[PDB]
Amino acid sequence: MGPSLDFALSLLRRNVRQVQTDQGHFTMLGVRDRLAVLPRHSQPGKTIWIEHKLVNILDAVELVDEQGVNLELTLITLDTNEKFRDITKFIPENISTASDATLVINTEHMPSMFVPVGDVVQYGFLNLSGKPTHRTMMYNFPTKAGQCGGVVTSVGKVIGIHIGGNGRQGFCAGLKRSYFA
Ligand SMILES: */C(=C/C(=O)OCC)[C@H](C[C@@H]1CCNC1=O)NC(=O)[C@@H](CC(=O)[C@@H](N)C(C)C)Cc1ccc(F)cc1
């Protein structure tokens, strides 16, 4: 096995989970300890369904920038025994671009799905069905419903969470390491 494939599969096995909220199916990224991240629009309630079981959410922090503008991420703290393998060191200190990224999706409807979205570029501002949103990046791939939460990855780096699309292009909320400090 090559190393790119080994890293994505390991991500699926240890960190990228199938979840459902009352808003539908999403891909969740577990980052470290009991800390995971979802797209804010998933609106996790007091419990969330993770793979095969209902898991209690102890805390949910919706991330905004300094202008109070939406970043489209929610940090959730889970009531579980598991500590996620810590992948914080694979998350850049600042929102970074990449070449030939792969989007890793894991949902009940789209299990263990690899989507070659190509180069990921700085985009910045995105208007999400009436909600202004900062710190996004963009890939010219026609992503679809059911793919939100998907993890944007390239050469052993975890750089974003899939949040939206327009039929031609897709957009992620950029990851930075300090969110998970
Ligand atoms: C992922 C979430 C989803 O499936 O919604 C139903 C649960 C999608 C992915 C989009 C859909 C089409 N292509 C994609 O990659 N995210 C959304 O649908 C997102 C809104 C958009 O993408 C808009 N372009 C819209 C016109 C389809 C959801 C969203 C709504 C409101 C917000 F404040 C933030 C996000």
Q: Comparing C-alpha atoms, which of 28, 14, 25 is closest to residue 57?
A: 28
Q: Set out the domains of the chain in order of their start, with CATH numbers.
A: 1-15+85-181 (2.40.10.10), 16-84 (2.40.10.10)
Experiment type: X-ray
C-alpha angle 135-139-145 in degrees, rounded to nearest 5: 90
Which helix (H) or strand (E) segment holds residue 2: the answer is none
The alpha carbon of 7 and the centre of ligand 1 are apart by a number of angstroms equal to 27
- State the resolution, in angstroms: 2.0
Catalytic residue positions, numbered: 41, 72, 148
The alpha carbon of 131 and the centre of ligand 1 are apart by a number of angstroms equal to 11
Give CA–CA dist 6/63, Å, rounded: 31
Q: Which amino acid is at 137?
A: M
Q: Comparing C-alpha atoms, which of 1, 4, 2 is closest to residue 154?
A: 4
CB of 41 closer than 6 A to ligand 1? yes
Phi, psi angles (nearest 5°) of residue 22: -60, -15
Paired with 53 in beta bridges are 50
Which helix (H) or strand (E) segment holds residue 149: the answer is none
C-alpha angle 128-93-170 in degrees, rounded to nearest 5: 30
**Beta strands per DSSP E along the chain:** 16-21, 24-32, 35-39, 47-50, 53-64, 70-78, 98-105, 113-128, 131-139, 151-154, 157-165, 170-174
CB of 144 closer than 6 A to ligand 1? yes
